[PDB]
């Protein structure tokens, strides 16, 4: 599913993402936007290390979900990577929260550093009623 901007902003808010571990909803929007274009089916194979990024947040198989084909990988969210390809984002949100409970927080995603950190992210939630 490819979410519309405000549709996702409200979906994330209902799932408890607004200010989770100090991360505003607009940051989460900027992350999903740049990671997948708000697309839950998004996937990116990393030929260099044999891992794959899954879903709207592009969570990597090396550490967060199990896909059975990533060498010496871990499954910190204890989910099948398939769970991150659902139209319903509940599991992806639970896993996104898991990622940020780690030291780096939102900085875990290099795309967030590249396109969201120290930027005006207000535009992502403007007019969404969140």
UniProtKB/Swiss-Prot annotation:
Its EC number is 3.2.1.17. GO terms for biological process: antimicrobial humoral response; defense response to bacterium; defense response to Gram-negative bacterium; defense response to Gram-positive bacterium; inflammatory response; killing of cells of another organism. GO terms for molecular function: identical protein binding; lysozyme activity. It is an enzyme of class 3 (hydrolase). The keyword Signal applies. It is found in: Secreted. Residues 1-130 form the C-type lysozyme domain. GO terms for cellular component: azurophil granule lumen; extracellular exosome; extracellular region; extracellular space; specific granule lumen; tertiary granule lumen. The active site is at 35, 53. Keywords: Amyloid, Amyloidosis, Antimicrobial, Bacteriolytic enzyme, Disease variant, Disulfide bond, Glycosidase, Hydrolase, Secreted, Signal. It catalyses: Hydrolysis of (1->4)-beta-linkages between N-acetylmuramic acid and N-acetyl-D-glucosamine residues in a peptidoglycan and between N-acetyl-D-glucosamine residues in chitodextrins. Disulfide bonds join 6-128, 30-116, 65-81, 77-95. InterPro entries: Glyco_hydro_22 (IPR001916), Glyco_hydro_22_CS (IPR019799), Glyco_hydro_22_lys (IPR000974), Lysozyme-like_dom_sf (IPR023346). It holds the Pfam family Lys. CDD domains: LYZ_C (cd16897). Its main location: secreted. Transmembrane segments: none annotated. Monomer. Belongs to the glycosyl hydrolase 22 family. Lysozyme C is capable of both hydrolysis and transglycosylation; it also shows a slight esterase activity. It acts rapidly on both peptide-substituted and unsubstituted peptidoglycan, and slowly on chitin oligosaccharides. It is linked to Amyloidosis, hereditary systemic 5: A form of hereditary systemic amyloidosis, a disorder characterized by amyloid deposition in multiple tissues resulting in a wide clinical spectrum. AMYLD5 primarily affects the viscera, and the predominant clinical features are renal dysfunction of varying severity, and intra-abdominal bleeding. Inheritance is autosomal dominant. Lysozymes have primarily a bacteriolytic function; those in tissues and body fluids are associated with the monocyte-macrophage system and enhance the activity of immunoagents. This is Lysozyme C.
């Amino acid at each position: 599913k490819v979410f519309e901007r405000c549709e996702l902003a409200r979906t994330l808010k209902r799932l408890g993402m607004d200010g989770y571990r100090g991360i505003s909803l607009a940051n989460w929007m900027c992350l999903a936007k740049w990671e997948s274009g708000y697309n839950t089916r998004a996937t990116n194979y990393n030929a260099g290390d044999r891992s794959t990024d899954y879903g709207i947040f592009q969570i990597n198989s090396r550490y967060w979900c199990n896909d059975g084909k990533t060498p010496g990988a871990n499954n910190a969210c204890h989910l099948s990577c398939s769970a991150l390809l659902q139209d319903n984002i509940a599991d992806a949100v639970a896993c996104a929260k898991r990622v940020v409970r780690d030291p780096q927080g939102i900085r875990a995603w290099v795309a967030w550093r590249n396109r969201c950190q120290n930027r005006d992210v207000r535009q992502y939630v403007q007019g969404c009623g969140v």
